[PDB]
DNA sequence: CCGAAGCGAGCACGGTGCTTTCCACAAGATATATAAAGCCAAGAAATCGAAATACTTTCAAGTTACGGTAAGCATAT
């Protein structure tokens, strides 16, 4: 992912839209170097957490009410600190970088 | 019948320090036969060493799911 005369570093998502959303009816998750032999400018690693990041629906999102704090102690007593510890392995998409 | 000229010639040259073709017939050669004994000697049958075309495992190589901080931009005070 470096040094490639190939790969674009912008930040917004120039036909993103449709070079990689269109995957999610072709292929499966697995498999990515399929992926970027189409897609100019990006390359796997990166699309696949941009992807997992964009596409994921069970995320705790919203505004902080008053019945938040209860979820995220629940979330802390499942296994423990969970953040960077072993423990972040099992859990499902609750990653630490989140 | 002697005379001249070749001409062949015995005579000398110092002291020492054998092969094969036949009658001679008198022996030889090739002939069994036990019979114990070990070995040499060539033809099959059993056995084992070298190894190649294959199977396990080791080992290099890149692409894999999963972060570690760090920086550019939106919006509340």
Same mark, same amino acid.
């Given at each position: 992912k470096?040094?490639?005369?190939?790969?674009?570093?912008?930040?917004?998502? +120039?036909?993103?839209?449709?070079?990689?959303?269109?995957? *999610?009816?072709?292929?499966?998750?697995?498999?990515?170097?399929?992926? #970027?032999?189409e *897609? +100019?400018?990006?390359?796997?690693?990166?699309? #696949?957490?941009?992807?997992?990041? #964009?596409?994921?629906?069970?995320?705790?999102?919203?505004?902080?009410?008053?019945?938040?704090?209860?979820?995220?102690?629940?979330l802390?007593?499942?296994?423990? *600190?969970?953040?960077?510890?072993?423990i972040?392995?099992?859990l +499902?998409? #609750?990653?630490?970088?989140?």
């Amino acid at each position: 992912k470096s040094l490639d005369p190939g790969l674009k570093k912008g930040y917004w998502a +120039p036909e993103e839209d449709a070079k990689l959303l269109q995957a *999610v009816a072709k292929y499966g998750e697995q498999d990515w170097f399929k992926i #970027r032999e189409e *897609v +100019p400018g990006r390359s796997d690693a990166q699309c #696949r957490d941009r992807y997992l990041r #964009r596409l994921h629906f069970s995320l705790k999102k919203g505004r902080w009410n008053l019945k938040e704090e209860e979820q995220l102690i629940e979330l802390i007593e499942k296994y423990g *600190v969970g953040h960077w510890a072993k423990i972040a392995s099992e859990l +499902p998409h #609750r990653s630490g970088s989140q």
